């Protein structure tokens, strides 16, 4: 259900889009690794939502909606919110490993 | 250099082979998640090496050699050994995320 797409594809899912941005340190002004395995923070959440909007060509993509989509992963063992930090989330390797299986 | 292959492929790299086994809990008698994001343990290292040997059709694959190949990741920000535990290693999300990029 949460499935691997081709990198840079329009069909990519949000979890894998975020990993794509994280994997290039040059994006750190909008999204960056925290340092603690799998934790990341959106230093510019609106720019993250803008870029997700552009990838998906969804009009009116905004942080309200991105945060709704992000909420959907908390049940899927893909990601959780990090409490006490601003715009901070943590990937779950255990759900991510399955996402790479057929 | 550490690159994504097709699941179940003979051309798969060791890091992704291990994730494949981890992703199916039924393999826990030889290899299983520890619970702490990305940490895993080989409950039967010889059976892990046997299965890697079978995938790769390498004769005389054994734990000595697997542990040599595993050593190669400690420089690549893919994996490190967990000290104080038996046959225990930890994936690094930061190197794994790049492994999914072109």
Curated annotation (Swiss-Prot), chains A, B:
Chain residues forming the annotated DNA-binding region: 12-92
SS bond partners: none
Compartment(s) of residence: Nucleus; Cytoplasm
Top-rank lineage group of the source organism: Eukaryota
Subunit: Identified in a IGF2BP1-dependent mRNP granule complex containing untranslated mRNAs. Interacts with SETDB1.
Disease entry from the Swiss-Prot or TrEMBL record: Ewing sarcoma: A highly malignant, metastatic, primitive small round cell tumor of bone and soft tissue that affects children and adolescents. It belongs to the Ewing sarcoma family of tumors, a group of morphologically heterogeneous neoplasms that share the same cytogenetic features. They are considered neural tumors derived from cells of the neural crest. Ewing sarcoma represents the less differentiated form of the tumors. Chromosomal aberrations involving ERG have been found in acute myeloid leukemia (AML). Translocation t(16;21)(p11;q22) with FUS. Translocation t(X;21)(q25-26;q22) with ELF4.
Similarity section: Belongs to the ETS family.
Function per UniProt: Transcriptional regulator. May participate in transcriptional regulation through the recruitment of SETDB1 histone methyltransferase and subsequent modification of local chromatin structure.
Protein's name in the database: Transcriptional regulator ERG
Species classification: Eukaryota, Metazoa, Chordata, Craniata, Vertebrata
Residues of the full protein shown: 300 to 401 of 479
């Amino acid at each position: 259900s949460s499935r691997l797409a081709n990198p840079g594809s329009g069909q990519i899912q949000l979890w894998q889009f975020l990993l794509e941005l994280l994997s290039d340190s040059s994006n750190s002004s909008c999204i960056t690794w925290e340092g603690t395995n799998g934790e990341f923070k959106m230093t510019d959440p609106d720019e993250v939502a803008r870029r997700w909007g552009e990838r998906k060509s969804k009009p009116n993509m905004n942080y309200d909606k991105l945060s709704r989509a992000l909420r959907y992963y908390y049940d899927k063992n893909i990601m959780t919110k990090v409490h006490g930090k601003r715009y901070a989330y943590k990937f779950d390797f255990h759900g991510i490993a399955q996402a790479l299986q057929p």
